[PDB]
Amino acid sequence: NYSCPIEATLALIGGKYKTLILWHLKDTILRFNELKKLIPKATPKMLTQQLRELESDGLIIRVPPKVEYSLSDFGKSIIPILDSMCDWGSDYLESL
Amino acid sequence: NYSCPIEATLALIGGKYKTLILWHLKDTILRFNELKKLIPKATPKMLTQQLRELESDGLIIRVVYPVVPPKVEYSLSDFGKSIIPILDSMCDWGSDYLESL
């Protein structure tokens, strides 16, 4: 099919704050509180729901109690797409 | 405002259906009825909202041919075409993710 693969990609990372969550998690790992401070305008429950959906799809790893979020290996496999999205957005902003 | 660049990319193509629309216009021109049938679960009004936002951001062109009835066509602008390589990468990544689990 022509569009089924990109529709899968979008199911996995198109969700509000998901691509941002993965961006901020590349090469570092963070608490719930740190991530929500990096992404204002996000109801705690919304951020939790997005992180749980990502962990369930296997893109992030979740392992006084501390929980910290990491990128899985398969989650690191998206970083080049994220880097190109960054470079494209940088072109757009520097050209304004 | 945006603390990073990727936030600007998301503001341009991240809203629902925007990226699929751009993908379907790749190498083509499409009327609205044909996009509807390619994105069957979207409501017409939401698809129209997203189309107008893409047009306003300069990612797609809307051309009216004044035959009876008028025929509205959509295509990628040159700015919209500059995102095709990222969509190709997204397509490859999704294909590899499908191939296993």
Side-chain angles (χ1 to χ4, degrees), chain B residues 20-66:
Chain B
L20 250 176
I21 284 165
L22 296 172
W23 172 255
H24 281 301
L25 292 169
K26 159 178 160 260
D27 294 339
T28 335
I29 72 189
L30 287 175
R31 305 163 40 57
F32 182 71
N33 299 351
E34 305 163 359
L35 274 162
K36 275 151 139 178
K37 298 215 97 57
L38 298 160
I39 302 172
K41 313 174 175 161
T43 68
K45 195 173 177 67
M46 176 55 53
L47 187 73
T48 292
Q49 191 174 111
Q50 301 299 79
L51 277 176
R52 300 300 182 265
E53 281 179 6
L54 282 173
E55 174 175 13
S56 171
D57 287 324
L59 292 159
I60 74 180
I61 299 306
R62 183 200 199 259
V63 179
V64 175
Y65 294 112

Side-chain angles (χ1 to χ4, degrees), chain A residues 31-95:
Chain A
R31 305 173 62 82
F32 183 82
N33 312 125
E34 302 181 287
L35 275 170
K36 78 183 181 185
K37 302 326 172 166
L38 300 161
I39 297 102
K41 170 60 165 166
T43 76
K45 193 123 200 70
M46 265 302 328
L47 283 173
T48 311
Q49 177 200 127
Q50 302 296 66
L51 288 154
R52 189 174 177 173
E53 289 184 32
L54 279 168
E55 176 193 14
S56 163
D57 291 329
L59 287 163
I60 65 169
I61 273 173
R62 190 174 182 179
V63 180
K66 66 180 176 53
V67 305
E68 297 172 337
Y69 296 96
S70 314
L71 282 180
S72 59
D73 287 330
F74 169 69
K76 290 165 193 158
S77 80
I78 201 162
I79 276 176
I81 292 179
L82 302 175
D83 287 340
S84 63
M85 293 179 62
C86 180
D87 295 318
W88 194 81
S90 167
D91 269 8
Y92 175 71
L93 287 188
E94 293 211 298
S95 83

Side-chain angles (χ1 to χ4, degrees), chain A residues 2 9 12 74 77 85 88-89, chain B residues 9 23 79 82 90 93-94 97:
Chain A
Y2 173 74
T9 290
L12 292 163
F74 169 69
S77 80
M85 293 179 62
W88 194 81
Chain B
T9 302
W23 172 255
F79 179 32
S82 75
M90 286 175 66
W93 192 84
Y97 162 78

